[PDB]
Amino acid sequence: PYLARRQNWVNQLERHAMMQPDAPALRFVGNTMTWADLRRRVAALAGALSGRGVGFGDRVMILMLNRTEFVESVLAANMIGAIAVPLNFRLTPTEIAVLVEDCVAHVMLTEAALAPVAIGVRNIQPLLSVIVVAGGSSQDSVFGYEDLLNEAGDVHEPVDIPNDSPALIMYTSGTTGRPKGAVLTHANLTGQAMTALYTSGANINSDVGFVGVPLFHIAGIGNMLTGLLLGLPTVIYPLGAFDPGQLLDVLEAEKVTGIFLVPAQWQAVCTEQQARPRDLRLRVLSWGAAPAPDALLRQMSATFPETQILAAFGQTEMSPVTCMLLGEDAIAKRGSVGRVIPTVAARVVDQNMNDVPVGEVGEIVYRAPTLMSCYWNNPEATAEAFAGGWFHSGDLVRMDSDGYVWVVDRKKDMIIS
């Protein structure tokens, strides 16, 4: 459990397996995985990895779509002190091979659909030695996922994990030269879960989480923070074509209490819900990653009364959520990204790292415990990212008298592109 005064989602998993063994932990395509089941599988994967040389600090690649084995893989790697490296599954074998060489990883946890990709990564980069395939069997110099769990299993020796220990390397999609992997400690992740707690809120007895974005993305991995900390079920939604009717059917059946959607998706869901309503238990609606028309925000409020509407901003692989826009201000301060959250310090600076007058445009820079530790094995990029003692977001913003942040940048047209 919470022994040695540590706080991380591996200790959280143990506490939940002890206190509520048969409680729902993950829901995937209609099947429930309890905390006792998740802990048993994670410990079995951690024992199979530990028996193959994976030790404290080693890097474990993950190349999976949205499925339970993803969460099992992150937790199993962290359980033995290893660093999980989630991968964009749309990357080519060459692009993945470049990442393998950057963090020097010897193990990749993938699934059957992406098995030919991991095979190609090994042929390019022989550093990749152990490929485990979820849903596949042990064949072709590859280990079956279920085959490794059914081995000795739970041979995990209890590992002391300091909170400042690296838990994830989130490589940025910005391929502007040498790759940049943001290192996120458990303390980082805990503090980001805290931001979710004083914005979205929590109900210990009734909440049900939902992750419908890719789990390899920081937004997806972030929607697991609440469920793993508070011991609440999380619905993992398969990635596929967007379907408002099916999504609402699933939200109705799973009794989901909070979901994130982009504004275009919200418009599709609201028109479907206003036409054929589902008995939903939604408590909080989240939007972002696109501007929301004022008519849409009011349609959401009308389609879903008695629900709070939030919009987070600033989270990337390197940065946490930095600004929050609560539905009370989405109309008074429309077009804004909110105010800087109370666990983050921010300045609006110019090219010489000097503060601009209030209301003037500059780059927003951050100081917070929830910032990334560094870029993995890249002191030069890390020094540039933290130039002057503040993290550089690269966003031109403008802070007004009330503390609200307006992000200024030229809009994008999809027809031209």
What does the binding site for a copy of itself look like in residue numbers (CB under 8 A)? 1-3, 5-7, 12, 15-16, 18-20, 164, 187, 191, 194, 197-199, 201-206, 229-232, 324, 326, 328-329, 339-346, 367-369, 371, 389, 403
Of 233 and 244, the one with the shorter C-beta distance to a copy of itself is 233
Q: How far is the CB of 94 from a copy of itself (least distance, A)?
A: 36
* Residue 283 and residue 257 in contact, taking contact as beta carbons nearer than 8 Å: yes
- Nearest distance from residue 23's CB to a copy of itself, in Å? 9
Q: Nearer to a copy of itself by C-beta: 122 or 339?
A: 339
Beta carbon of residue 368, minimum distance to a copy of itself (angstroms, whole number): 5
Instruction: Compute the least distance from the CB of residue 168 to a copy of itself, in Å.
Output: 16
Q: How far is the CB of 293 from a copy of itself (least distance, A)?
A: 23
Least Cβ distance, residue 328 to a copy of itself (angstroms): 6
Q: Decide whether 37 or 95 has the Cβ nearer to a copy of itself.
A: 37
User: 263 near 287, Cβ under 8 Å?
Assistant: yes
Largest CA distance in the chain: 64
How do strand 166-171 and strand 181-185 relate by DSSP bridges?
A: antiparallel
Which residue, 19 or 29, is less far from a copy of itself as judged by CB? Answer: 19
Q: What is the CA radius of gyration of the chain?
A: 22
Q: Would you give the distance in Å from CA 290 to the centre of its chain?
A: 18
Q: How far is CA 263 from CA 16, 197, 294, in A?
A: 35, 23, 11
Query: Could you give the CA distance from residue 103 to residue 83 in angstroms, rounded to a whole number?
Result: 10
Integer Cα distance of 129 and 106 in angstroms: 5
Considering beta carbons, is residue 138 or 343 the nearer one to a copy of itself?
343
Query: Which among 240, 296, 234 has a CA at the least distance from the CA of 271?
Result: 296
Q: Which residues of 232-268 are buried (b: 16+ CB within 10 A; e: fewer)?
A: bbbbbbeeeeeebeebbebbbebebbbbbbbbebbbb
Tokens (6 digits) for 412: 């994008």
- Find how far residue 378's CA is from the centre of its chain: 23
Q: Please, what is the minimum distance in Å from the beta carbon of residue 400 to a copy of itself?
A: 13
Q: With respect to a copy of itself, which residue has the nearer C-beta, 326 or 356?
A: 326
Give the shortest CB-197-to-a copy of itself separation in angstroms. Answer: 4
In the bound state with a copy of itself, the residue whose beta carbon lies nearer, of 177 and 389, is 389
Around Cβ 230, how many Cβ atoms within 10 Å? 17
Q: Which is nearer to a copy of itself, 54 or 229 (CB)?
A: 229
Cβ atoms within 10 Å, residue 61 = 27
